[PDB]
Amino acid sequence: QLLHLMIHSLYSNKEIFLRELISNASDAADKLRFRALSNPDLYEGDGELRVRVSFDKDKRTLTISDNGVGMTRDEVIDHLGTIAKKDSQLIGQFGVGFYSAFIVADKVTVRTRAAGEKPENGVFWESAGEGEYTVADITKEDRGTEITLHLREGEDEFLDDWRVRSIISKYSDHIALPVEIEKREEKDGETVISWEKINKAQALWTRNKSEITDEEYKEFYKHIAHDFNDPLTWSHNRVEGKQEYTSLLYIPSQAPWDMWNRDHKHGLKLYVQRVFIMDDAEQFMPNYLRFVRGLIDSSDLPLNVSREILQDSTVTRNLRNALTKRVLQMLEKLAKDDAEKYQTFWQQFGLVLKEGPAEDFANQEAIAKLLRFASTHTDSSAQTVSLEDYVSRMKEGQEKIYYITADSYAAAKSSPHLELLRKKGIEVLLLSDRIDEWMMNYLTEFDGKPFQSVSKVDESLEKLAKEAEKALTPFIDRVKALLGERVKDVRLTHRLTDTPAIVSTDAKYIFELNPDHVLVKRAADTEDEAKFSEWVELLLDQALLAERGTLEDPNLFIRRMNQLLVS
Amino acid sequence: QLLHLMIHSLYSNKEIFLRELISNASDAADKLRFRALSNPDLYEGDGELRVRVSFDKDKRTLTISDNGVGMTRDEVIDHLGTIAKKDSQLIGQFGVGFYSAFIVADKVTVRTRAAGEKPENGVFWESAGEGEYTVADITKEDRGTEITLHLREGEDEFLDDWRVRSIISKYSDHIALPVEIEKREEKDGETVISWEKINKAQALWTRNKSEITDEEYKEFYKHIAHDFNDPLTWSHNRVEGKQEYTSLLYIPSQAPWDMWNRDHKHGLKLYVQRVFIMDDAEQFMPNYLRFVRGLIDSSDLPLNVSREILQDSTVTRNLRNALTKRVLQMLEKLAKDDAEKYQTFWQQFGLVLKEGPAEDFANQEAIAKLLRFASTHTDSSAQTVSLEDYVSRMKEGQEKIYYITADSYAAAKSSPHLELLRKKGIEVLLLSDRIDEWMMNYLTEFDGKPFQSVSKVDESLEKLAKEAEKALTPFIDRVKALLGERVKDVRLTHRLTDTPAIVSTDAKYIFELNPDHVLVKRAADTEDEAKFSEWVELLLDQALLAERGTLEDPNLFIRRMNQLLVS
């Protein structure tokens, strides 16, 4: 996680630390304001919660001091000293700030006092970034945390009133916490201090969709999803009545590490009356949409809600399905708006969506519409085509959608099953993904047209000369005598293709041959019993290798083929 | 077990029941005489233990009455009534008798009284063979068992004094228990009863090897091994001194059902001073000889011996290794005497012997000598050849014995590895058995000549023109450019054979080619880059299929080959 944190902790853009810290400042406020309810005293009278930035020209320090929830010693040791010489859940929001901060500064100093704790139990922390941190019990009367930055020789860039104020607003905007800054005017005798907020300060989601710029939207995704790839696109939707909730969903441009662990990240940030209640709550998404990220501010749920109350009760189930559609909404929408970006989304989340048709039955059609496959239309492994792109191609009588389920692209693309339809002028869905085979067990019918796998048949190829069939009946008898009962039967089918023969099965195998193939004719010219049996044995062993990719005596097949070549 | 019990319970030969019953009579005596020691009273004064046969002309019944150990009710119910409407361990000795008896008789009546039990707790048993048996508490003063046979209409054959006496001795001979029979002479007033034994009565193994006929030896194997295939051959050996023990081992002609279970049968019958002590004790064989069957009469072991004392102590370990050699002795011997019968033994026990070289290190050479493989000498899957038969073929400089380890005959026989030596004029051991691969890890060296698998190389083929090698170095470069790094290297070896190319590995793969093959020349004539790559790709994919029997994209390989054929 941190490596591709570092690449842009560079950015070359440096000033990043400030943002990331303000992020921390906010989340701090939240966790505080949350913990408030269960012990209304922790505010200690000081209820105007905020964050004040300051700086000293002579000692050359920048100084971010919030009055959130602060830290217990153990927390300072468990976090800051897990950064010196769960844990990635601290590196989550906090890591970026740390390392980034040490880009601009050469000594960093923390000075906390966790909300509620006695002012003697405050804490102190310092390091020159090296393999060494220094932590000590100290006193700090106020509540919260104070971070101070010994600036590195030659970064006076950050002592410039205008530069800082700028760098502030360039993030302060999308942030719910009042971000003040040091206004000191020195008159002779009265060196007067006051603090001015550069921030509108208002939960961005509680604001109205018109005034919220794309910037505020993107950067807000950063701050809530601990990612700094820009998001793909979002959904800011309010609701009044019984269910009065606001909700704001995003869709990431790039999928996280632990998407393919059974260890989470997922969930949405659940507020109740503009008050944080928990991060990464995962009731409000179906598991086939887990990649959804964002928050939801309900005015209906209990003020003492738990993950138990959520998971069990019913207002959740409703809230879920609603948000679900909201998301499918967002995707269909993005699908038609910026197909460039959706192609991105698909390459980044398809495999998870594909879980959907089995899970959320209700919206099954809508989900299908979102899928994006690859097909014989173009010989690229790229998964561009859609179910409409397919129906839009269909020919008369083509009442089913034809697909194949392999283990990889080249495989499916090589399969003989294809050439029947590739010749007759049809389109074939190439499902060269792991899950696909399971998917189809639920992806039964779309747009009135059912799905039917080439790897079998019924009344699909039942419709899709007879004298060659006649002479084929003497040939058939010759074969049935040649083998007998290693094969359940012998048939002559017109899976035209360029492959001679093929085994099949019902709902040992059934041997099938193609009257129109050169090898079939050059094996029909055979009277010599040696080559007769040799050819036929080759063909059977072949169709086996084609349907199982393994042979009893491989070296034998190899020997036979190599013989008929040189001769 | 019973089905191939029935086939010869037929025999057509009928009279079999009598034998099988007398068998029962003996074993009965034994278990009794054994139980005697731990409670010397059970003899009830009656110490002349025996078995008396009688018969009634008018009621038409034959009547075998032994004074062994009898049966508790529960035993009569658990055994005889497991035969009506462990358990195969009762069907072991007893089943044959039962069913056979009901061949000659139409009602059978048992009448027991288990040794020690009160005469009121005797038991009674009867049936017309059908799905119905009848058992009742009864009184019988004497100890032991009495079996009575209501003879079937038209089998008066068995009421004939001479017929019976004959049928008696035709088994009584090899049996250790005195087999008496009813001598009644009717004088007017004195209808006098006495009993005359038709049996020498003496533990056949305690007798001397000269007087014991082959009959007595074979039939005795029957009686101890509950089998009535004739044995293959045996070993009757006595020992005096510290270890004074007699021992008599056999080797079955046919291997039992449960040879290939992890549920036993094996073990030898351990006597201590001519007194049975336990059947199927398996300390006195190594597990690679478990198919050994027979008994051993020690005069040294404790009179209160357990399987614990046996397995743990040391006199066993000695006794074992001794008997072990005795068995290898017996086999070498049979190997040279009747190669017809040994071929039988091998077909019937080889796979178990083959466990040996890993287990019994001491006799490892001797064991090897016994093995019997199959080799290119003749294209039959039959495993006739031996390690001497091989050395007796060897050519100058051939310092190693060459073998191949496959999954089946045709496989190993098809392998390309062979043709190098098949051409250069050598012999190849075909090990197409499961265990072989494990065996060789211990079967390192024999008769000074080591073993070396064709499936690898060292200084074996290091010894077993250079201008073709030169031009091959331009060709090699062309190939190394064609592929690059899907193969660790490209080489040209002279594994002459008729196979073009082959991958190898050390102690991805290494690609190797045969300058002398037609396909190699017809691929050296190639300038067209399309076929150039097409040929080479084919060759690589081939050698893969040859060394793994599976391909990434099989249908592709198939397509390529089929193309080059028709074109």
Side-chain angles (χ1 to χ4, degrees), chain B residues 34-47 49-56 58 60-81 83-84 86 91-95 97-98 100-152 154-169 171 174-181 185-187 189 191-195 197-199 201 203-290:
Chain B
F34 163 41
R35 204 183 290 196
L37 304 167
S38 316
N39 194 327
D41 314 288
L42 304 200
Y43 281 128
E44 292 174 39
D46 186 40
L49 334 175
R50 73 288 196 298
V51 42
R52 302 187 167 176
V53 164
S54 57
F55 65 136
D56 178 284
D58 319 300
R60 279 212 19 180
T61 70
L62 186 63
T63 317
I64 305 86
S65 191
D66 68 74
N67 34 299
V69 72
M71 331 198 213
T72 61
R73 184 196 189 87
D74 302 83
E75 278 175 87
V76 187
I77 296 182
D78 276 325
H79 295 180
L80 285 160
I83 308 177
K86 185 182 198 65
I91 305 177
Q93 178 73 98
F94 290 57
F98 183 91
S100 72
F102 269 104
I103 292 293
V104 306
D106 55 354
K107 148 227 124 204
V108 186
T109 284
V110 196
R111 224 192 61 167
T112 127
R113 201 274 273 179
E117 289 279 339
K118 311 196 277 292
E120 331 138 24
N121 290 321
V123 188
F124 158 89
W125 192 93
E126 190 157 343
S127 176
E130 290 278 35
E132 51 185 15
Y133 67 124
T134 288
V135 45
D137 217 39
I138 69 170
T139 294
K140 174 169 75 63
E141 243 260 281
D142 53 73
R143 177 209 56 217
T145 294
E146 178 177 278
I147 295 188
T148 306
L149 286 108
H150 188 184
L151 279 151
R152 298 167 139 296
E155 308 304 303
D156 311 80
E157 187 170 296
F158 299 87
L159 296 168
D160 289 340
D161 204 319
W162 71 89
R163 177 46 175 251
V164 163
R165 286 221 174 190
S166 161
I167 300 289
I168 295 304
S169 58
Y171 302 100
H174 72 253
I175 308 161
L177 200 61
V179 184
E180 316 210 33
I181 192 172
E185 4 111 9
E186 281 102 20
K187 311 165 302 111
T191 297
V192 178
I193 288 191
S194 38
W195 300 83
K197 64 183 69 42
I198 309 187
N199 185 9
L204 169 147
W205 69 92
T206 218
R207 281 208 320 213
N208 168 42
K209 317 177 36 198
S210 336
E211 309 106 25
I212 304 167
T213 179
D214 284 340
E215 276 34 61
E216 283 158 340
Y217 266 127
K218 296 182 157 217
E219 219 57 31
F220 182 82
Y221 158 73
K222 268 140 196 298
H223 164 294
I224 43 85
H226 310 129
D227 174 21
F228 62 142
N229 295 304
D230 283 278
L232 271 186
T233 173
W234 54 92
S235 132
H236 190 169
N237 318 134
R238 197 150 54 264
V239 175
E240 328 205 3
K242 266 170 84 183
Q243 326 196 129
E244 174 108 34
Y245 63 85
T246 309
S247 99
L248 164 41
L249 315 183
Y250 293 73
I251 285 181
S253 83
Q254 205 177 124
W257 206 117
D258 33 284
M259 173 146 309
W260 291 129
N261 282 0
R262 204 171 70 90
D263 216 304
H264 77 109
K265 221 306 200 169
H266 54 125
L268 302 167
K269 312 178 66 160
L270 155 67
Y271 285 68
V272 168
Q273 293 157 248
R274 313 256 240 101
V275 159
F276 186 90
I277 296 300
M278 51 175 88
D279 214 320
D280 306 322
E282 40 197 65
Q283 281 68 14
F284 310 153
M285 270 330 140
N287 277 47
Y288 86 95
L289 278 178
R290 50 168 170 275

Side-chain angles (χ1 to χ4, degrees), chain A residues 410-411 414-416 419 497-500 517-519 522 538 542 545-546 549-551 553-559 561-562 564-566, chain B residues 410-411 414-416 419 497-500 517-519 522 538 542 545-546 549-551 553-559 561-562 564-566:
Chain A
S414 71
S415 181
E419 286 266 41
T497 192
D498 304 338
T499 300
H517 204 25
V518 180
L519 299 193
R522 196 183 283 203
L538 179 137
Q542 193 150 115
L545 181 58
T550 313
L551 302 182
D553 185 352
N555 312 259
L556 193 66
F557 188 90
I558 283 182
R559 191 160 295 270
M561 152 181 167
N562 277 19
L564 300 180
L565 288 186
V566 51
Chain B
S414 71
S415 181
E419 286 266 41
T497 192
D498 304 338
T499 300
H517 204 25
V518 180
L519 299 193
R522 196 183 283 203
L538 179 137
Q542 193 150 115
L545 181 58
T550 313
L551 302 182
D553 185 352
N555 312 259
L556 193 66
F557 188 90
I558 283 182
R559 191 160 295 270
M561 152 181 167
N562 277 19
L564 300 180
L565 288 186
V566 51

Side-chain angles (χ1 to χ4, degrees), chain A residues 427-445:
Chain A
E427 182 150 273
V428 195
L429 285 182
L430 315 189
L431 281 67
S432 81
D433 307 283
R434 188 178 173 175
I435 169 175
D436 299 343
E437 159 97 350
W438 177 61
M439 185 160 73
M440 297 316 308
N441 283 291
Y442 299 87
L443 209 198
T444 49
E445 168 183 271

Side-chain angles (χ1 to χ4, degrees), chain A residues 192-195 197-199 201 203-229:
Chain A
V192 178
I193 288 191
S194 38
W195 300 83
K197 64 183 69 42
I198 309 187
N199 185 9
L204 169 147
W205 69 92
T206 218
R207 281 208 320 213
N208 168 42
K209 317 177 36 198
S210 336
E211 309 106 25
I212 304 167
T213 179
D214 284 340
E215 276 34 61
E216 283 158 340
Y217 266 127
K218 296 182 157 217
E219 219 57 31
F220 182 82
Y221 158 73
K222 268 140 196 298
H223 164 294
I224 43 85
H226 310 129
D227 174 21
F228 62 142
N229 295 304

Side-chain angles (χ1 to χ4, degrees), chain B residues 401-413:
Chain B
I401 301 85
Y402 295 106
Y403 66 102
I404 170 193
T405 56
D407 286 309
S408 55
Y409 184 65
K413 182 162 193 301

